[PDB]
Amino acid sequence: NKITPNLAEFAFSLYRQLAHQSNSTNIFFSPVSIATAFAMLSLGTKADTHDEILEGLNFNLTEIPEAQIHEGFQELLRTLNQPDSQLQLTFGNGLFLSEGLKLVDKFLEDVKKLYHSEAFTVNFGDTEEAKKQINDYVEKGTQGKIVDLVKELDRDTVFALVNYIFFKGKWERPFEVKDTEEEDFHVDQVTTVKVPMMKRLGMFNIQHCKKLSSWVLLMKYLGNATAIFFLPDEGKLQHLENELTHDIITKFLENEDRRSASLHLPKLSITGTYDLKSVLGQLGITKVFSNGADLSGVTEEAPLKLSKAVHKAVLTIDEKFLEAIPMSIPPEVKFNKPFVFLMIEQNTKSPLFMGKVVNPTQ
């Protein structure tokens, strides 16, 4: 609740960072999985090292008490890993520390207690074997969906962090597979490529927002989440990207109005892999990754730093009551060119995912 605004801001800061690099690859990550992981990590850091982290996650410490921060991440975690409820979400974070280091019990506690996360010890003396364990942890965690995540480890690595998330939720209102068919997806102003296109004619929470200069579609997932798709007008993609804000999103989530439209949405599966040291570094989080790292909350007498941090986010979208639709020409809304999207957990309103699809068949 209290940290939602901060998470929404971190999501935009990260997205805009990634968007500046490439403009051809499909951006896709979990602001929530990344933030939760480093907020947890900060519990083992002090002073500068500790503040760069929370500030890197868009938390102004001069205004928000640390207790409120961790408290927010904890209520959010309860929601995501609720036994009784749906969502069909698989995520996790793994901390791998060198054996031989004397860990501080308290840290290990809060990790497995407050953030209900996992901490492991490994022999980094054997680099190939260490990343095999790490990768097996991820693979096993994602039922084999995410394999060989970590490709390398420098030799002096004594602490590594892996954060993964896989989502394949079902729509509240399904698509007809028999209606799904190959269509052109415009990757350029004059170039096209074929992709499987799901389609449906019905009452949709959809509208053309003029401030974003793009179509905005909201669709509910089974459970407590909602997907938001933004289709920018010809040449308005980056205008869209710069205009996005938390309030604008909140507004869309408030609207309940539906209307008829023939929708064409691509059936796809996209992934996103990022080097957090490189990416979060550009966000000011560099201390915890340096030799000057103050991680006395993790190990007391020996020097320590986080030498490896990786994030992987995977999303699958497919076809997955009686409506009333008027017999008037409905708008045909085709997501057959680059678009942006957001996944919002309904309870906390936090941004579960965020990405851009420039090429579904990439």
Numbering used by the authors: 24 to 343, 352 to 393
What text comes from the article?
The plasma protein α1-antitrypsin is principally synthesised by hepatocytes and protects lung tissue from degradation by inhibiting neutrophil elastase. In common with other inhibitory serpins, the native fold of α1-antitrypsin is metastable and this property is utilised in the characteristic serpin mechanism of action.
The 2.2 Å crystal structure of Thr114Phe α1-antitrypsin adopts the classic structure of a serpin fold in the native conformation. The polypeptide chain spanning residues 24–393 is highly ordered with the exception of residues 344–351. The root-mean-square deviation (r.m.s.d.) of the mutant and wild-type structures, based on Cα positions, is 0.4 Å. Phe114 makes no interactions with nearby residues, and therefore, its effects are entirely due to partial filling of the cavity and changes in its packing environment during unfolding and polymerisation. The aromatic group of Phe114 closes the upper part of the cavity with its side chain just 3.7 Å from Leu103 and 4.0 Å from Asn104 at the top of helix D, distances that permit favourable van der Waals contacts. The volume partially filling the cavity in Thr114Phe α1-antitrypsin is in a region of high-solvent accessibility in the wild-type protein and also yields the therapeutically desirable combination of effective blockade of polymerisation whilst maintaining inhibitory function. The estimated size of this ideal pharmacophore is 59 Å3, equivalent to 22% of the total cavity volume in wild-type α1-antitrypsin. In order for α1-antitrypsin to adopt either M⁎ conformation, residue 114 must move laterally by 4.6 Å in the plane of β-sheet A. This is limited by local steric clashes in Thr114Phe α1-antitrypsin.
